[PDB]
Structure formats: C-alpha cells, structure tokens
C-alpha cells in the first residue's frame, strides 16, 4: 500500500556514443551528438543518483506492485516542452502526458506539455487488473517516454522502463526475492537524422553505445536471473534476439530466440549454468552486419556449488554408436533437378548446362553430406529413399544417444558447424568466439581446406522442453565463419530435439506416423564463395563480364524451399486419419518475414488450430498436421511478386479405392494388402512387439520422474454438397458490387474544424465491396446497423457455430470473376475457390471462378477443429476474401471475417450469434497501385505516382477510414470482445495499443501484454476491460504511423447513462417540440411524461383520418448528447384506452441527414416495440447506445388513437457527468453542512441535511432560518473531485411556494478556504439563473469544472424565501 515517489528530470547531456577514460583524445572529443535523456534525482533535486554504467542513455527505472501508487515529480530542465506516457490502464485525463484531440478543458492541458524550467506531479494507480496476478511471468515490463513529440522525443534520447510487477514478490530496494539480478536491456535505432540535432546516423546501438562497445556485465553462476528485454525505434524494426549456448522460458515455451518489435518489451528468465563468456547475437540479417550485441561474462563466486543426477537414471542410458561422422563437398548442385516432369527455361540452358556455353556443367555448392562410416570411405545414400530428394542430415538429439559430430572438412575453404541452444563443453569450442584459450584447454572453431575435427555435446535430459511446446523442437545449424558468405554457399541443415522417443536404437517416433523436412532457403549467388567457381573460372561468355546490373544480379538471387526450385514432381501424398509431422524454418540475406497460408487443413498450435505460421529469420518451427480430408492441396508463402505466386508444394491427401495402396503409385510400407500379410509396424522381437529398449528382465524402477524433482521439502441456384455433411446449416447471401469509397472521415464533418486542409490526395476511389441480402433473389438487401457502423470496408460478419454447417450464395456483380475462400474450416475442392490444379473436370471448378453476372453456392463445413478451443475464450475469429488473385483483391476492398463461437452462443434475434460485445478490427495499410480501379496516370503527376506527393497514393487505414472510425463504443468496466486480424499487408508488422487500456488473452487463462504486436496472418481474439470514460485514443505506437493516419478516438461513456434528458424535468423548454401529423388538440408542448392536466400528449392540429402514415415528433436538444432508451406511456382524459404497440426511432446531428435505423435495429430483426396499456411507465433500451442532437419517434400501430408520451433516457458530453450520490444513497448526510436546521416552534424543523433530488416526504429542502443573502450550502466531497453540473430546485409546505432565483458559487481548494468563481473571461464574479417555477428543474454549467472537495452555494438574489434541493454531478478523479 506504499507508494512510489520517484524524482525525475530532463537535462541536455553531451553525449558521444561510446565511453573512455583517458585525457589526451577525451578533451578534445573528435565525436559528439547532443542528446535529452531521463535522469533520476534525490528528492528536492539536490544530489543526483550514482546512475549504474550499464545504462547509458535508458532513464530511471519506474517501478510498482500490484496496489501501490506513483507520484513522480517531474521537472523538465531542458530548454522544450516535454512530458512522460506510461503504458498500461491507470491514467485519467490528467496524468496521461499526451495531447491530442478529446475535447478537455484547460485544467487537464497542463499534464501534456510542461513547459522548459516548470514542476508537475504525475499520479497513477497499479489496480487489481493491470498486473499479472496468475501464471504470467513473475512480474512484467512496460516502456514510458515521452508522448509530446512521439518521434522528435525519442531519438533525441527519451526513454525509460516501467517495470509494474505482482502482488507479493518485489522488496524495498526494487529487486525480486526469488531472482538473483535485475537486467534491462535496450536494442534501439537513434536516428540522429530525426532528432534535436539533426546530424546523419548510421547507429544500431543498445542502451546508447555502438558496435558492441556496453561495457561487459557479468554475474556469478548456476543462478536465477531475471531480463528485461525493451526495444524501441521511430521506425518498423525487428529485434530477433538470440541467446547463445543458453535456454530462456518466455510465455511457458522454451525457446533460445526472443523476438521484439518496435517499441514493445518482455520479461523472462533463465538458469546460468558453467562459467565462461558468451554473447548476445541478434539473428535479424540487418542488426547483424550494423554490429549490436553484449558480453555475458560468468564469474565463480564461492557460495555453493550444486551436485544433482549425472546418469539418465541408471536405465535410459542409451550409450551406443549413434554419432554423427559429418562433413562437407563442394559436389554438383542441380536447382531443376535431372530431367524433371515442369522443366525451366532460365536455370537451365542458362545457369548449369553447356548449352550456348554459359558455365559448364558444375556448381561448386557446398552442403553436409552424411557418411555413415568412421574412417570417411562411403556415403550412405548415393540415391533417393523413395520420398527425401534433399531431406537434410537428420540430427535427432534426445537424451544420451552417444551424439557425437565427427567433422571431416573436404572442401577449398575454412568451414565449421555451430548449433543452436546448444552449450558447448570446455574441450572443443563449437563457437567461434574471440577468446580462444592456448595449447593446453584449446578451443578451435575453424577446419582449414583438408584438415579433420571433431566436436562433442552429447545432450541429457536436463533441457527438456516445457509441455506447452511442441512435440519435437527444431534448430538449425550453419557453418559460423561468415554466416552470410557460408549459408549462400549451401551450409545448412535441422537439429531436432525430441523428448524421449527412443524405442530402438535406430530411433523412430511415435504420435506421429509421416515426417517431411521443410525449410525455406534463399541461396544469393553473388555472397557464395564459388561464384568465381561460376562466371570467373568456368564459362565462355566472361568476354564482357555481366554485372553491376539488374538482369545479371537478380537472375542468380534463387529463392527455394529445400534447394529444389521447380516442383516436388511427387506431390506429398498421404493416408487418411495420420498425424503428418513438419519441421518449418527459413535463412538468407534478407530482412522480411514469411507467412505460409495451409490450404486445406489447419494444424494444433497450443491447444488452438491455427491456419498460417509467421517463420521468423534464422529461427525454426514445428507443427503437426492431420488427415482429415480428401483431394489436392497446397502450401504456399504470399508476400510479394518474388515469393508470393512461386513458393507452392501440391500435396494430395487422398486414398482410393481400399487404403489407395492396391493397385496405385504410393506403396507405403503396412502395407495396406490382406491383413495376414507382412511389412513395417509388425517387428516382435524376442519378448513381445515394440515395448521399449530391451534391457534387462524386469527392471522393478519403471516410474517416471517428474523431471527436476519437487526438491525444496436467372441463376437463383442453391447449395448442392450438404448430403453427408449432416449439418444445422445456416444461409447467407452475400454479393459484390463497385462503390465509391474515400478514407478520410473526419472531413466528413468528424472533426473537420479547419476550413484550409489542402486535400493532398484524389478525392474518393472506386473499390469493391461486399455486401449482405436478403435472399436468393437479389436487390432487396440489408442496410448496416448500428452494431456495423465501425465495420469501414470489411463485409458482413458472417457467424456459426460448432458443428455448424454453412451456405453461402456468392454473386458477383462487378467487372470481373471473384470468388471466396475460407480460413481453418473445412470443405470440398468444389467448395474452396482458390485457383490452381484439381483432381477433377471442370466440376470441381464451379466454384474456382465465379463470373460476373453470376452466383455461386458454396458450402462450408466447421468442424471440431475449426471452433474456438481454449476455454477461456468464446469465438474465434477469422477472414474470407475473393481469391481469384489474392493480392490485388484484398487491395480492392474485398475482405471480412468469419467468426466461429461454441454450442450455445445465439440469442432470439434471427439466432445469428450474439450476448456479448465484440469490436472487428483489421489494421492494414491500403495501397491503390495494387488494386484494379488505379487509373494509373492520376490527375496529379502522370510521369511518378504524383511526383508531387510522393508515395501519397498509400493509406495506413484502421478497418477501413482514417482519424475517424465512427462507432467504438463501450460503456465503463465492460468485458470487450476484439477480433484484431492483419492479413493485407504483410511485411509491416502492427502493435496494437489502446490508451488507459490493458488487452487480455486466454487458454492459459491470464495474460495481459500491455499491448498487442498483430502479427501478418494471426487471428487474435482479446478481451478489454474498459477502464475510465472520456475521449480516449486507438493508436499503433510505431511513431511513424501513428502520426501517418492509424489513430481512432474511441469512446468511454459512463457505466450508469440513464438519466432524464429533460422531458419531464423541464431542461427541454417546450420551444423546440415539432410535429408533421397531429392528433387533433393535443399541443405538442404537453407531450412531458407523467404530466397531468386536461391535455398531455402530441398534436397540433386536426387529423380526421390516421391509420395508415407514419406521423412524428421531433426532440430538440440543442447540443450533441448521448440516448440510451425510451420511456413510451399511454395518454386518456377518462375514457380512451388509446396506447401504441410499435413504433420506430429516427434521429440526426443536423436536423437534415436523418438515420431512421433504431427501430428496426441490429437486435431487431425488421421491428421495434412499444407499450401495452394506459399509464403504466414502459421502457425500451438501444443496445448500442446511439449519439446525436436531435430525436424523432413515429408510431406505426396503436390503440385507435397513435398517441404516446415519451421520456429519454441518456447521459452527458465530456462522457463523466454521473450522479455524485445525492439521491442514490452513495453519499452519506454527514458530508453537507450549512449554517441553519431552521426550527419553527410551532411546527416542524427545514433540513439542509435532506437536499435530494425527486426524494419525497416531509420537508425534503432546507428553507434557512432567516432571509438574508449571507445564507450558503457548503459539501464536502471527501476527496478532490472534478464537479461538472448542478441542477437547483425549488420547495414548499402545500401552500404559497417560494424558490431560489439566482446564485453565485464560492469554492475552496483541498483545505479549508472559499473563493467566488469569477467567470473565466470576466473580471467579476459569474451569476447564474436558479429556479423559474416550483418543481421545473433548471441545469446551470461550469466552463471550466470545479476541482475540488469543498464548494459552497450562495442563495444571492431569491423569490421570498431561501429553499433549494441540490444535487451535483461529478466525477472520480485520482
């Protein structure tokens, strides 16, 4: 319950890139940059703290448990405005640091730019649903900066940790109990360029210094260490750290590579093991070559040194010839191989064969060859074994299988291997590292041109993955020289680290049957080590030496999957109900990502079926997939022009006509004949068939551990397919139709203010669209509700069920085919629309293309593996797109998603699935050079894509428009839904943050992130928790496309917007009650609720005729305000039954543009309801709460007579202007006082302790004592709140009444003062206007709110008598 004050300052430290004590060359600095960083300070600023080496530039670390709070004291001592933003869900519009557009008064403008030589205080609060609190690491990491300038306060060296944790672990000094360190570390890119002192940069530092100059740190070892790993940079980078030789636990999966975007962090730990130095690599091929990495030195501190189990438990020992005698060659390398079925015309009358003499017939190209004996005398695989080709040498390392790497270099050049998550015993290096020690504990790294080696780790089972991994881990290894130079050269191969699967000592698998190896290679030519071996030495057309041009460069750039560019000529055929395992990984000189989208089948992913894998550069992969389907399939990557439409592996999945094994080209080896016959899986041995490895008779010591032990004690057409699928089908009718569509909103009267934006883009463009009808026949559709306001571009959401069956009746109606194609669901060839080859005539090809003019019925099936598993969560998202040319069709606008939810999930409201909100976002940037509809030569440039503005013609969208994205709407402390997917652009990875907001995942039941990195082609489903109302921000926090248009502000109401909106209160004068139809005499002004009289409801004039139009009133409001229901009655004088039945809503900001939407809404199907009898108060509510000055009702069905009175039922504007607890009880009678209980004494006592609004009773107002103007109501708020609204009134004893009539209001501070509340541009005090008649309410505003817990009323000039009943409406500020 601490809290934690922490002193901060900003000064402008002269800082070069690097440190050195010395004199001579550190005066005279040759080298230098101007720089504002964070330092701490003492408290009152008057010593200044020790500042630890390690952080050069990295400010303070913040820090917090789960319960405390922060009041940091800032004071900015540079010469510019700056400001602090944290991240996470604490602040309130006072403590947030960032300014932006959310319509706050000047009081709250203060937090967002402090000005140079000025104090503040910033103030937060850890609450009990912002920290871990569950199986999430111990505690997390979040990243503050400054929010002022998000690109021109950053580089200029701005930036600090927030390092909030859980309740119960952290100690005084700021260090976890458990962990032994407290690390932090910083990968950033500081673009001097974009800076305070614009000078170029070339820095890829960490911490601030550059090429690896951080002084070594260094601890003691075999402890527990705890990381910090941040990383920010104005641009989209990517930091894909890599620990050598150890294992890290991040997120319960074991893995030795941590990946970090651009302004994100993470926390994780790790065990030291043995002494002796190491490195932190960064395996991005682009941080690699700048030079950015630290020094992990192990000291030997004599405490205790531990001493557990050596021997695989006596038994599992497993100690045979099961090494590995590698090498390498420099043999032949076909790209095409010899004769294939789809030959190439450019690799090979080109690249390999003496055909127009271009080479020879050789490629010098490397690659670790297997032979199987010690002495280096045979292969062991001259030919293919039926289904490998290239299949590399399988390292398959489990505990003590004797893994030993005899390495024999046979090649022309110094090469080596170097593993992965693999540590290294003292006698053989395995690494080259610097330090190699001399001729006694030698450790060499490199083999010359002939030599031989040997190198040594054997594994045991102390690395065991955690159970939440996969199945077999992969890894890869490459020779460790020159990465780039080798692996171009062809070094690469996949280490697997199983568990223990060993039956045998041949060492098969189980739980899963078939195995493939894939990885994607991209061998450049021109960084290979033969490439003289290719144009220099063997040719005979080097007579003018093609290069340094664009055809001879990138003609040689070969990017393949298992070296083999033209096809797998067997397509990977398979059986019916196996568990096929693949090994997934990717290298070469490149930066980007890749994304490989399985066509067909889907594969477990922690319990979830995910659909597409993001490979991360240099690190591998591992999924399993089923067989559970029938036909051709693919595999395919889509990036770009160079990968997208080139890397595809056809697979079969198919079986025909028994087993497909009888007569048929894929003899697998059960063999699928006559049961009584012979073959593989059949092996019984001299006990019995497979049990283990056969050791001796018994062996009682048969249990399995636990691991480390638990120590420390007209084409109308329909569907045609739904036969055997068996399902509760549900029907869709979606088309496809031109449009015009421009992005930007807020000129479409959002927040267009400005009357001077030179537009600097085309007006509108002309998209297509999906859309949503009716049924079968077309042209009666269904317009967007409410609910689809927010959806921008994408189409109708289309919702199942598990177990589910789907029709969908596509029908393009645009200028040229389109189809659809599904994400993890499951159909037919003739249900799929992707374009490539089938199994059948064109009738499995109905559906490949659907022309225009035309329709489709497709028919999609989602099964147990396409529902959301996970139980923490309820649907599953996903995405639909026309696939007919999937790049240029999702650029066109042609895209939506497709959510899955489990059994139950639909309410009476067309069953379509619904009981809980859910906002659908798709983050992507649209490119109109990629779509159809781009004119090319536009109106503004032809020569460029508008020389003029260039690169203009690209928008970073959120879900469609930009700025604006009306219809995010949430109420305060409401579980969200969001279904945030990223598949159109891909390289441009998206980290999703919401301001004063913490996402939330599920599965494992708790995670809370702080923000979301989308990866390009993850379905991610979240939960939100909305914290506080006001006007809030969605924004990516990657400053160069936060300010490029990816900002939303987004809206939190209150939790209680249901208060009258002036109808019966009288707020709403009767000046502004219109009418179209009338019901004879009934002037509108008497349409009040509960008003008494002769005449209560609406006309105007005579009817004589109203059964059939639809007559309206139209409420007035005069400002924008918020609705959230009704309240209808019935009218009579004693006679007339006379109520409605049904009746829709319109409304409108302008009085002009009418939406009359309300009625037959989003929970409707095409109706609304409305009252039942006479006066009995009935109320309906708007679900998604709807926003605008004006109201218009019209009933349709009544009682004889459509008349009706109504009520409204919204909230306020700066969205916190709920009831302080006057009247609801939540304020006690102990915090008001006044000056008189008045008595009389003949009769009864007036209490200035009763001031309830609509409270009835005995004298329920407080008459004072005496008329005087020196009379006042003082309330003490108890705590410092921001009061925003007060509404008067007025009070009697049955007789002559007598009311307050004009007030002025004195206030205090936190203590005990009183201060007139002088108008803001006056120079006296401000009078308001009180009551006019007895019961009438009347709201006076404040401009600017009173911030305070003391505020007085002053009773000024009254009719006849002092009496008010008083009611405040404020907020909770912290």
């Not at 579980?975 to 907001?997: A, E, K, M, P, T």
Request: glycine share 6%.
């Amino acid at each position: 319950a601490q809290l934690r004050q922490f002193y901060v300052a900003a000064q402008g430290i002269s800082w070069s890139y690097r440190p050195e004590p010395t004199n001579s060359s550190l005066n005279l600095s040759v080298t230098s940059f101007k720089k504002i960083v964070y330092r701490e300070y003492e408290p009152y600023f008057k010593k200044e703290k020790p500042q630890s080496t390690i952080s050069g530039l990295l400010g303070p670390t913040l820090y917090a448990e789960v319960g405390d709070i922060i009041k940091v004291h800032f004071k900015n001592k540079a010469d510019k405005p700056l400001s602090i933003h944290p991240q996470g869900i604490r602040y309130s519009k006072l403590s947030e640091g960032a300014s932006y557009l959310d319509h706050t008064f000047p009081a709250e403008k203060m937090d967002d730019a402090v000005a140079p030589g000025r104090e503040y205080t910033y103030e937060w609060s850890i609450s009990e649903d912002s920290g871990p609190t569950h199986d999430d690491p111990p505690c997390l990491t979040h990243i503050y900066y400054s929010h002022e300038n998000l690109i021109e306060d950053f580089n200029s060296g701005l930036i600090g940790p927030l390092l909030i944790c859980k309740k119960g672990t952290l100690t005084e000094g700021g260090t976890q109990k458990t962990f032994d360190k407290q690390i932090v570390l910083l990968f950033a890119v500081f673009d001097e360029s974009k800076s305070w002192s614009q000078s170029s940069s070339l820095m890829y530092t960490v911490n601030g210094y550059v090429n690896g100059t951080m002084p070594d740190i260094t601890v003691c070892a075999h402890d527990h260490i705890s990381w910090h790993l941040l990383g920010m940079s104005s641009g989209p980078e990517l930091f894909s750290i890599h620990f050598n030789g150890q294992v890290l636990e991040q997120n319960h999966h074991k893995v030795s590579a941590i990946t970090l975007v651009s302004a994100t962090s993470t926390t994780a730990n790790m065990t030291v093991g043995p002494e002796g130095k190491w490195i932190i690599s960064s395996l991005t091929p682009k941080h690699l070559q700048a030079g950015m990495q630290a020094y992990i030195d192990i000291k030997n501190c004599p405490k205790k040194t531990r001493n557990l189990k050596k021997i695989t438990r006596e038994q599992r020992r497993h100690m045979k010839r099961w090494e590995y005698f590698i090498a390498a060659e420099e043999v032949i390398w076909d790209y095409a191989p010899v004769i294939p079925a789809n030959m190439d015309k450019k690799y090979r009358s080109q690249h390999l064969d003496n055909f127009s003499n271009q080479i020879g017939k050789h490629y010098k190209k490397v690659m670790y060859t297997q032979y199987e004996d010690e002495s280096f005398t045979k292969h062991t695989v001259n030919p293919n074994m039926k289904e490998d080709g290239i299949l590399g040498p399988i390292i398959r390392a489990q505990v003590r299988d004797t893994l030993k790497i005899v390495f024999k270099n046979m090649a022309s050049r110094p090469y080596s291997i170097y593993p992965h998550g693999v540590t290294f015993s003292p006698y053989e290096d395995e690494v080259n590292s610097s330090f190699t020690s001399g001729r006694n504990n030698t450790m060499i790294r490199a083999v010359q041109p002939g030599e031989t080696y040997t190198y040594k780790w054997n594994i045991l089972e102390f690395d065991e993955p955690t159970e939440n991994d996969a199945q077999c881990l992969t890894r890869p290894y490459y020779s460790d020289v020159d990465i780039m130079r080798d692996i171009a050269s062809g070094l690469i191969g996949l280490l697997l680290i199983c568990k223990s699967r060993s039956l045998d000592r041949r060492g098969i698998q189980r739980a899963a049957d078939i195995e493939q190896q894939a990885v994607f290679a991209v061998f450049d030519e021109n960084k290979s080590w033969y490439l003289e071996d290719n144009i220099n030495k063997f040719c005979e057309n080097p007579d003018e030496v093609k290069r340094d041009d664009p055809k001879f460069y990138e003609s040689n750039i070969m990017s393949t999957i298992n070296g083999y560019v033209p096809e797998s000529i067997t397509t990977l055929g398979f059986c019916f109900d196996d568990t096929v395992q693949w090994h997934f990984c990717s290298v070469g000189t490149q930066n980007e990502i890749l994304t490989i989208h399985f066509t067909g089948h889907s594969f477990i992913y922690g319990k979830r079926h995910e659909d597409t894998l993001t490979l991360f550069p240099m690190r591998g992969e591992s999924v399993t997939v089923t067989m559970d389907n029938v036909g051709t399939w693919m595999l395919t990557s889509m990036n770009s022009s160079p990968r997208s439409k080139k890397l595809r592996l056809k697979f079969r999945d198919v079986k025909c006509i028994p087993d497909d094994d009888e007569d048929s080209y894929e003899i697998f080896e059960p063999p699928e004949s006559t049961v009584m016959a012979t073959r593989k899986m059949h092996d019984r041995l001299e006990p019995e068939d497979e049990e283990s490895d056969a050791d001796y008779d018994y062996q009682n010591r048969l249990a399995a551990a636990l691991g480390i032990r638990s120590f420390r004690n007209p084409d109308n057409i329909a569907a045609w397919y739904l036969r055997s699928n068996n399902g509760n089908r549900r029907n869709y009718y979606i088309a496809a139709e031109e449009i015009s569509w421009d992005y930007s909103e807020f000129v479409q009267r959002e927040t267009d203010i400005e009357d001077s934006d030179d537009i600097p883009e085309d007006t509108t463009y002309k998209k297509v669209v999906f859309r949503k009808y009716l049924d079968s026949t077309f042209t009666k559709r269904d317009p967007r509700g409410e609910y689809e306001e927010h959806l921008g571009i994408l189409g109708p959401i289309i919702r199942a069920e598990v177990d589910d069956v789907i029709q969908v009746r596509f029908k393009n109606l645009a200028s040229r085919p389109y189809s659809l194609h599904a994400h993890g669901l499951s159909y037919e060839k003739s249900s799929e629309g992707k374009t490539y080859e089938d199994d059948s005539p064109e009738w499995f090809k109905e559906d490949n293309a659907v022309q225009p003019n035309s329709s489709y019925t497709y028919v999609w099936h989602a099964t147990e593996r396409s529902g959301p598993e996970s139980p923490g969560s309820a649907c599953r998202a996903w995405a639909y797109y026309s696939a007919v040319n999937p790049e240029k069709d999702i650029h066109s606008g042609l895209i939506g998603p497709l959510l899955i939810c489990q059994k139950g999930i639909l309410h009476k409201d067309s069953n379509m699935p619904m009981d809980m909100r859910e906002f659908v976002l798709l983050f992507m940037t649209f490119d109109e050079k990629k779509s159809w509809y781009y004119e090319k030569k536009s109106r503004s440039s032809w020569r460029l894509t508008s020389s003029e503005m260039k690169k203009s013609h690209e928008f970073h969208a959120i879900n469609g428009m930009i700025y604006s994205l009306p219809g995010l709407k949430m109420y305060e402390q409401e579980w969200v839904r969001l279904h945030l997917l990223n598949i159109g652009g891909s390289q441009d990875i998206h980290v999703v943050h919401f301001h004063g907001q913490t996402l939330l995942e599920n599965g494992n039941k708790q995670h809370q992130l702080g923000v979301w990195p989308l990866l390009p082609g993850s379905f991610k489903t979240l939960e939100m928790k909305a914290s506080k109302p006001g006007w809030w921000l969605l924004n990516t926090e990657v400053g160069e496309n936060q300010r490029a248009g990816m900002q939303t502000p987004f809206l939190i109401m209150d939790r209680d917007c249901r208060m009258p909106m002036g109808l019966s209160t009288g707020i709403i004068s009767d000046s502004q009650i219109k009418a179209s139809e009338f019901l004879g005499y009934w002037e509108p002004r008497l349409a009040r609720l509960n008003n008494g009289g002769s005449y209560n409801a609406w006309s105007v004039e005579k009817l004589a005729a109203e059964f059939a139009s639809k007559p309206w009133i139209q409420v007035d409001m005069q400002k924008e305000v918020i609705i959230t229901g009704i309240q209808t009655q019935g009218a009579k004088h004693y006679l007339k039954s006379c109520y409605t039945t049904e009746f829709y809503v319109a409304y409108s900001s302008n009085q002009i543009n009418w939406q009359i939407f309300k009625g037959n809404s989003t929970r409707n199907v095409m109706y609304f309801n409305g009252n039942s009898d006479a006066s009995t108060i009935k109320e309906n509510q708007f679900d998604p709460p709807i926003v605008a000055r004006y109201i218009r009702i019209s009933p349709t069905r009544a009682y004889n007579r459509p008349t009706l009175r109504l009520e409204l039922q919204g909230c306020e504007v700066n969205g916190c202007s709920t009831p302080l607890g006057m009247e609801n009880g939540k304020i006690e009678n102990k915090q008001i006082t006044a000056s008189s209980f008045k008595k009389s004494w003949w009769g009864d006592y007036w209490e200035p302790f009763r001031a309830r609004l609509n409270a009835q009773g005995r004298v329920n107002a407080w008459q004072a004592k005496a008329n005087n103007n020196k009379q006042w109501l003082e309330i003490d708020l108890l705590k410092i709140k921001k009061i925003t609204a007060i509404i008067t009134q007025g009070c009697k004893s049955l007789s002559s009444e007598m009311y307050v009539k004009s007030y002025t209001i004195h206030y205090s501070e936190q203590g005990v003062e009183w201060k007139p509340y002088r108008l803001k541009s006056s120079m006296v005090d401000k009078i308001f206007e009180g009551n006019t008649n007895t019961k009438g309410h009347v709201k006076n505003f404040f401009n600017p709110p009173i911030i305070s817990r003391f505020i007085r009323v002053i009773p000024k000039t009254w009719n006849q008598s002092i009496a008010l009943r008083l009611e405040l409406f404020g907020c909770d500020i912290y």
